[PDB]
Design a protein around this ligand. Sequence first.
Ligand code: 60V
Length: 384
Amino acid sequence: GSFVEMVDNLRGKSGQGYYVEMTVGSPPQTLNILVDTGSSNFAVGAAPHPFLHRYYQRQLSSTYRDLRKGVYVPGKWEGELGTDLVSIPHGPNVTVRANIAAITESDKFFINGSNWEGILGLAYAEIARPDDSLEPFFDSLVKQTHVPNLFSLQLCGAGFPLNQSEVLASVGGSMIIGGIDHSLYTGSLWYTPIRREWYYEVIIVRVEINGQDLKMDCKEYNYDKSIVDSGTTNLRLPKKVFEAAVKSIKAASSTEKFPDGFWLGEQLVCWQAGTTPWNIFPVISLYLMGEVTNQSFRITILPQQYLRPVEDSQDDCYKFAISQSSTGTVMGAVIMEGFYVVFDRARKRIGFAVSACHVHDEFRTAAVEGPFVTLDMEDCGYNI
Ligand SMILES: COc1nc(N2C[C@H]3C(=O)N(C)C(=N)N[C@@]3(c3ccc(C#N)s3)C2)nc(C)c1F
């Protein structure tokens, strides 16, 4: 329905991630926490670090409980396991006793200027560290309260660079805990099954670039998995898929030549203020397995999603936010910024709808459309 207390509770951007305010301990200690559907631990800075202006002080919490167990995660971090009372101020009006990994040592984990001091891993126990016995936050929340087993994310890319002050004052999106807010999307929600409960794994059955079929065996698109990950910036594709997609994107945009560094996601490209030639770049459609047998639907993104705005001048500059992976497809903030994404854990499915905050132009919009008749979709899934 309508969850006004949780609408607009995120801040951040695709490159540095999107975070929500949380409190830990008694009296409550406020921290900014990255929303991560790609991991399953709740881990917070718990010791001074040059890039942290605050951290969890266990000695100041009367409700802190020491689990007397370490956790080593190779970026990399090490911590100490414990439990405490946790709340989300712009969230459900509940307080949960949850596991917390108190980060004592780290390497390239905390980013200078991100404004977040910890991570909220929202995926399943299978990938929790040190093992699946460490109950993830969302599992605790559902078990201890009447909050429905579902959350939804609207990640909002600004479409232009935000400076330090603007990124702190800007609304970066919404995390709706326990429901679906109809103001965050347009049109219909289309659902794809969660293939397996570890990462939020899905199956891609067809890929198009400006309506042209990439025409690869669909198992290639999910080699070795395809996941939805708010913690990843880019749309990441398996090596062979990335090579075929970049060749097609280059061919579609061939009226302008870009250096190799641009296509590698390393180098920015700039245009005179307001002259970005969006129309030369193609739309990209990913077809996902539907809930009905032999049915699929598609999600279509624009270059306003896969060209990430970066500051250089008064030029409008971007980095190509599609990159290669050796660990399967990752539908990162590139994809998620185009859509309102419903993580329906209760019904083992992920919903997509056009986001009310996606960046577009007067000629094209992102889309979620269906149904399409698609055969042997189970063959698109990779095994071993
Ligand atoms: C919170 O505890 C854990 N965190 C992570 N990750 C892996 C990273 C990563 O490479 N990606 C892609 C991701 N989705 N999440 C991590 C991030 C680190 C900085 C981000 C930003 N910005 S996101 C955090 N993995 C495990 C196994 C954990 F136990």
